[PDB]
Amino acid sequence: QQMSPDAGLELIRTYRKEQMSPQQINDIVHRTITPLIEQQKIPGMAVAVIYQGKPYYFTWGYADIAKKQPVTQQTLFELGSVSKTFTGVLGGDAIARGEIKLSDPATKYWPELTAKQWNGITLLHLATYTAGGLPLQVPDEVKSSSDLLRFYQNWQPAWAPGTQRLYANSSIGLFGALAVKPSGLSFEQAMQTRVFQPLKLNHTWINVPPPEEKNYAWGYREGKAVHVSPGALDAEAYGVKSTIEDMARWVRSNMNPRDINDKTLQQGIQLAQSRYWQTGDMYQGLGWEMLDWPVNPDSIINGSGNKIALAAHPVKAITPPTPAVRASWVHKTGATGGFGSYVAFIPEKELGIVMLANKNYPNPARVAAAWQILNALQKNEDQEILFLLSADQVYQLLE
Amino acid sequence: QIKQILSLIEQQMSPDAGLELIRTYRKEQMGGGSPQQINDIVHRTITPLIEQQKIPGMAVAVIYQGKPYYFTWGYADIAKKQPVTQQTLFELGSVSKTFTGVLGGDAIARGEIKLSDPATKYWPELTAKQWNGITLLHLATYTAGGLPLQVPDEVKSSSDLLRFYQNWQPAWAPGTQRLYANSSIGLFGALAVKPSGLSFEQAMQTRVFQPLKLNHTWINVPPPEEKNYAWGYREGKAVHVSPGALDAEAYGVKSTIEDMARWVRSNMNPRDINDKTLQQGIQLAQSRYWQTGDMYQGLGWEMLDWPVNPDSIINGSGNKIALAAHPVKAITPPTPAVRASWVHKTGATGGFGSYVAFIPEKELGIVMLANKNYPNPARVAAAWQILNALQGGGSKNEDQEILFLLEQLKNGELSADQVYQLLE
Amino acid sequence: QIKQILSLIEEQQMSPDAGLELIRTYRKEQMGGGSPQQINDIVHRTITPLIEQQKIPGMAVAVIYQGKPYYFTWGYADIAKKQPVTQQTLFELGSVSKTFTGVLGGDAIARGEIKLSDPATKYWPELTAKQWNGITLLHLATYTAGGLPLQVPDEVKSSSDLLRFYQNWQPAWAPGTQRLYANSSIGLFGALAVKPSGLSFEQAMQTRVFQPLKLNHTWINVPPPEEKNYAWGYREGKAVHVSPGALDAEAYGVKSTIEDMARWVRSNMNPRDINDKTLQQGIQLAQSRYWQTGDMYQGLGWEMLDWPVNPDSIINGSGNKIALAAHPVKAITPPTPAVRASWVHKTGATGGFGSYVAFIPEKELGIVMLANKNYPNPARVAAAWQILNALQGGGSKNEDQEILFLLEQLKNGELSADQVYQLLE
């Protein structure tokens, strides 16, 4: 209608979505996840779908196989690396609280850290895996604070900071450990009072209280029931346990920060999705990873595979950090020895999905299934409409 | 009341805190920021500056608690016996860059550019190998690798300019040294307006000047305004800034003391601006991108942590230091505009000397326009004297040693009564 | 049409003079007209070659047609500053200031403060020399005192220095016999005419001429907030301003804008619209005819010729060879009241400014030419004559006398309507 093409593209997408609380949600969730459960031999799965700001939960399988215990909406799964999204957000909170700057060097908060190669390494580098070759894991022998200080003072980098991005638990682990030092609280207390309790995530635990071990599900690796074994900085990197309800609340909160009474935590949620680095079509936030939406499905699917996600890539400093783009695919994979988790959402379209499973199955399957689900819920061939914006030529070129 | 400050000086009084408070209580004790005290300190500082530096004419604006106070001396045109007035136009010189920076900032807030974009993105014909890793941020912050202080006077065409930049040999890698230069930020300003389709003068007019009602600020003085365009004076001769390549972006703005007071006010409190991308633009222009000594580089503006070491800004304004190369550490990501800052910029032409400096949290500011190019340390020293006196304190030795007395009351030792007896 | 005019003249209903004037406007509008376009055309076509020929940096011209002003600007008030001449630019009027001085004197007469027939020594008793016995204010105002010098000497720098200057002066002629243009004469007249008021000349001029006429940008001393409009004068390429001198305010020291000067010319054309009664009578007295020299009449500052004029006479007579020479005067006793059918004008100059003012009151026509270079008088008077004549119809004294003969016979008999029509066409 002689229209401004800008609104024409997106609004056309929304009408195409109006074509099809759609119980279709139940349909596509079943048609996508059931072949995934059967195909991957997944003992139990909890899946939450956020549609129009409202959660719809779906539970399959056993939380405890030998005990015939079913996965309920109160089952606790090991979030694994998804924990980082919390850490990041907590870090963001500190930034909003005026306690830290990402541009600050790490040693400003660990004074006892004095090795020469730690002079140009900043909290941003630790939070974004861009410190220059921190190992993917803290060594098992690290069991004390002086053991940890000994590990980092004797770490020798591969690269100069800000040049390379290597996914590592020690990087954002130390980031989380440092971001709370100006608070006075420990990491557990800080996360509990500044993130969990303000969002009323009342069954999300860094340490499962024994009165709650009944809901702690078993993870299954090679048929044996496993739980994540303790480690150093585990709370910052991979040691959060939550229920599908609390995780659905987590996605709701990371899509609509303007609904949170906490102002500092709101700005922190916004800062965790800021675009600090670029690699390919992926932007690195604080814990979260972002892409532009619409997105290339084979790119996020093949990019989720550990063959790529663990490989070091060079980064482009985005100055200033691009504020939280709503036309984004915000996601994070998680996994422990026995669990497999995935969180992905598109904030502009108010859409989200959480997928918790007590078996660690490959990330490409999770990103693939989530892409099929959220995809059918509403392409680059479509964006040819922006170039196509006469009336009969459009209606006929579509029909 | 002062006894309550002393008794508070416990963890109920910080490093600064009581220094600041005793400063404003000393302000209350002397005058108290009277519209008379302003005139008094401004005269006792600027008058000897004028007589010593042999400054033909001068205008000074003092922003105190967000209110402008204008002051005029001397002659805009010596021969014509024309006095400096509040409608007199001065050549801002390098202070023009504060506009360019802000304009650049606005472009960022519009999503038309990113400081991390490469220079070659907006000028593809810039094909030399040395331009490969150079970004708009490098150009805006004098960190491209050693661009020259001036664009040569003989650069007078587009091809002359292209050849100028192609033939430039960097002395350093991008992002490692700060060397102040008109070619750097000038090129930045010229590039930042290309996605808007406007000329630099038109973008500046419609995006900065007009939203701020800067109705007597010009890149090109229109003919009916030439009567207010003051003469610059270099060695007794009347002079005006000649046209040059990229002058509009680097040193070609002309303004009045009123418009300059409104500029400083707008950069102190962008929250009163209807234009949103201009407000964010100011915010980005006062962001801290690099650090050198105790100095942070914004977009045109330069910022120090407040309170500031007077000897550092005064000595650092001299051209032996201000124009030298210095190493930079990147502030990545850039810190947003810190209100506890001393934000300033010097400017000059052949025959004009100007300075602008403000402290945003204290709502304090000063503009100094003069039609002679006199040394920077004199300008920054006078400005520090005025702003220091007006904010409460006096003498750097008195500030350090009074901070010492308060630290003594903190570490027991001095204890309320003896501190007070020493102070009164 | 002309037919209506000739028939009306046959019917006694019109004077041959009114026939002459109306016919003048008719053939004026036959091809050109009194449209604001004819003004623009003749002004451009006259002043542009004047500026290009005389190498004039900047200029302002006001043309008053039927009491309305039309302004024109060229060039630069400040060359170096690239500052254009505008309607707020201040020029140095030079000797045109005398027209103000005269009018002020007239106002003084209308106030009953002075008499032109009083001796000068009455208002300056300390002037005790013998040669001052028969010299009156009229003599000083009209350059007929007996040979006062063109200039007051530069070494005259105090009131007593001035007294010594006038006491030791040697007259070459008896009062009332020769006209010698001189700043000392009318300058002394202006200084004396304000003495009974107790005001200074600057104060009397400000409150009694400038302020009643709303001449709000006319100055004897340019105040500091106005120096930005005070144009530079240019003499041999250098910028110059008129230096202070004895009696400068009375003789050549006024600065004005093209607007204020347009109001000055209108005020002298139609004083009948001025609330200030004594200023109105003062203007009228300043255009009275006190002496005759050739075809020229001397007023108070203003000089008058009968309109229409022989152009070569005003052009040639404006040159300094004649204008500064001594010429004998015939006394017009008593002075003729201000003749509206006159060419009333005055030239003025300083080192770096050249100005000219000329108006015809009966035709409500006028021109002001202010320029920041001192170029010869005949060029100014020629330009003004071309413009005003063109705007008035075509003129010429011989022509008007011929048409007046045909119209006189029209009122008598001899010709009759269709005759005069045929002879005119």
User: Helices (DSSP H) in B286-423: which residue ranges?
Assistant: 310-317, 319-322, 376-391, 396-410, 417-423
How far is Cα B121 from Cα B118, in angstroms, rounded to an integer? 6
**Does A160 contact chain B (CB < 8 Å)?**
no
Angle at the Cα of A108 (from A102 to A109), degrees rounded to 5?
A: 85
**C386, containing H or E segment:** helix C377-392
State the Cα–Cα distance between residues A362 and A342, nearest whole angstrom: 11
Beta pairing class for C83-84 and C68-78: antiparallel
Q: Is A109 helix (H, G, I), strand (E, B) or coil?
A: coil
What is the 8-class DSSP label of residue B361? T
Return the structure tokens found at C188.
């002394």
Question: What's chain A's Rg over C-alpha atoms?
Answer: 21
* Cα–Cα distance measured from residue C353 to residue C371, given in angstroms and rounded to the nearest whole number: 6
Q: How far is CA A150 from CA A138, A171, B164, in A?
A: 12, 15, 53
Contact yes or no for A373/A394 (Cβ under 8 A): no
Judge whether B94 counts as a catalytic residue.
yes
Render the burial of B306-323: b for 16+ CB within 10 Å, e for the rest.
Answer: bbbebeebbbbbeeeebe
Nearest to B83 among C80, C224, C239 (CB): C224
| Number of Cβ atoms within 10 Å of the Cβ of C116 | 22
One DSSP character per residue, B135-165 reads BHHHHHTT-SS---SS--TT--SHHHHHHHH
The whole-angstrom separation of Cα C154 and Cα C156 is: 5
* Angle, vertex CA B142, rays to CA B136 and CA B143, nearest 5: 75
Domain boundaries in chain B?
Answer: 58-378
Give the three-class secondary structure for C258: helix
* Greatest CA separation for chain B: 75
Q: Please, what's the b/e burial string for B246-278 (b: 16 or more CB within 10 A of its CB; e: otherwise)? A: bbbbbbbbbbbbbbbbbbbbbbbebeebebebb
Structure tokens at B2: 């002062």
Q: What is the DSSP string of C183-244?
A: HHHHHHHHHHHTGGGT--HHHHHIIIIITTTT-TT-BSS--GGGTTTBPPEEETTEEE-PPP
**If you compute the radius of gyration of chain C from its CA atoms, what whole number of angstroms results?**
22
Cα-flanking dihedrals φ and ψ of residue A45, to 5°?
Answer: -145, 135
The string of DSSP codes covering A128-176 is: TT-SS---SS--TT--SHHHHHHHHHT---SS-TTSEE---HHHHHHHH
**What phi, psi does B296 have (nearest 5°)?**
-115, 135
Evaluate the omega torsion of the peptide bond into residue C361 and state whether it is cis, within 30 degrees of 0. no
Give the Cα separation of B130 and B133 in Å (integer). 7
Cα separation, B22 vs B200, whole angstroms? 47
* A102 close to A287: Cβ distance less than 8 angstroms: no
CB atoms within 10 A of CB B210: 12
At A333 the three-state DSSP class reads strand
Is C257 within 8 Å of C217 (Cβ atoms)? yes
Question: Rounded to whole angstroms, how far apart are CA atoms C195 and C113?
Answer: 9
Look-up of token digits 């921190």:
A134
A116 burial (CB, 10 Å; 0-12 / 13-18 / 19+) is: exposed
Which residue matches tokens 């390919």?
Answer: A280
Question: DSSP alpha helices (H): ranges in chain A?
Answer: 5-19, 24-40, 83-96, 123-127, 145-153, 169-179, 187-191, 197-199, 234-237, 244-255, 263-272, 297-304, 306-309, 363-377, 384-387, 391-398
Residue B350 CB burial class (10 angstroms; 0-12, 13-18, ≥19): middle
Region B58-378: CATH code: 3.40.710.10
Question: Which of C82, C86, C230 comes nearest B80 by C-beta?
Answer: C230
Tell me the one-letter amino acid at C172.
A
Point out which residues pair with B355 in neighbouring strands: B346, B368
User: Does C238 touch chain B if contact means CB atoms closer than 8 Å?
Assistant: no
* Contacting residues of B for C224, CB less than 8 Å apart: 81-83
Both tokens of C60, joined, read 């302002």
Q: Are strands B295-297 and B232-234 parallel, antiparallel or unpaired?
A: unpaired
**Contact present, C93 and C291 (Cβ < 8 Å):** no
Chains touching A, CB cut-off 8 Å, 3+ pairs: B
Q: Name the DSSP class of C164.
A: H
Q: Which residue from C290, C265, C263, C268 is spatially nearest to C279, judged by alpha carbons?
A: C268
Tokens representing residue A177 in the block: 């450990």
B332, B335, B338, B339: best mutation site toward chain A, by most A Cβ within 10 Å? Answer: B332
| φ, ψ dihedrals at A287, nearest 5° | 80, -60
Chain B contact for A317, CB < 8 A? yes
Question: Quick one: DSSP state of residue A214?
Answer: T
B384: which residues sit within 8 A by CB, 6+ positions away? Answer: B310, B313, B314
Arch. (CATH architecture) of A5-60+67-398 = 3-Layer(aba) Sandwich (3.40)
DSSP letter at A277 equals: E
Answer for the pair A367, A309: CB distance below 8 angstroms, yes or no. no
The whole-angstrom separation of Cα B346 and Cα B358 is 12
Residues 6+ apart with CB under 8 A from A388: A394, A397
- The answer to whether the Cβ–Cβ distance between A320 and B335 falls below 8 Å is no
Neighbours of C323 (CB within 10 A): 16
Is A319 near chain B, with CB under 8 Å?
yes
Q: Classify residue A313 by burial, with Cβ atoms within 10 Å: 0-12, 13-18, 19+.
A: middle
Write out the two tokens for C259: 């607007």
Q: Is C417 exposed, middle or buried (0-12, 13-18, 19+ CB in 10 A)?
A: middle
Neighbour tally for A296: CB within 10 Å: 15
Q: Which residues pair with C349 in a beta bridge?
A: C354
Could you tell me the two tokens for B168?
A: 């430039």
DSSP state of B209: I
Tell whether C197 lies on the interface with B, counting CB pairs under 8 A.
no
Spell out the CATH class of C35-394: alpha beta
Contact between B89 and B255 (Cβ < 8 Å): yes
* B114 to A276: CB separation less than 8 angstroms, yes or no: no
B 73-112 residues with CB < 8 A to C: 76-77, 79-83, 85
The answer for residues whose C-beta is within 8 angstroms of residue B7's C-beta and 6 or more apart is: B416
Asked if omega into B68 is within 30° of 0 (cis), the reply is no
Closest CA to C256 of C301, C195, C205, C303: C205
C81 to chain B: closest CA residue? B226
What value, to the nearest 5°, has the Cα angle with vertex A379 and ends A374 and A380? 155
Closest residue of chain A to B338, computed from CA coordinates = A98
Strand partners, C83: C78
Q: Three-state SS for B218?
A: strand
Distance CA A271, CA A85 (A): 12
Residues 6+ apart with CB under 8 A from B10: none
Interface test with B, best of C86, C228, C241, C257 (most B CBs within 10 A): C228
- For residue C80, list chain B residues with Cβ-Cβ distance below 8 A: 238
List the single residue in C84, C228, C230 with the smallest CB-CB distance to B223.
C84
Q: A326 burial class (0-12, 13-18, 19+ CB within 10 angstroms)?
A: middle
Q: What technique solved it?
A: X-ray
Q: Which residues pair with B237 in a beta bridge?
A: B234
Cα torsion B163, B169, B172, B178: sign: negative
- Phi then psi for residue C321, to 5 deg, are -55, -40
Q: Quick check: B115 and A319 CB within 8 A?
A: yes
Q: How many residues does chain B have?
A: 424
Q: Which two tokens stand for residue C264?
A: 């000055």
Residue C93: CB atoms within 10 A of its CB come to 29
Residue type, C357: V
Q: For residue B343, list its beta bridge partners.
A: B303, B358
Report the C-alpha gap between A327 and A383 in whole angstroms. Answer: 14
Token duo for residue B258: 């009123």
User: In 10 A of CB C112, how many CB atoms?
Assistant: 9
Q: Which residues of C231-257 are buried (b: 16+ CB within 10 A; e: fewer)?
A: bbbbeeeebbbbeebbbbbbbbbbbbb
Q: What share of residues in chain B are helix, strand, coil (percent, to 5)?
A: 45, 20, 40
- Residue linked to tokens 């100094």: B368
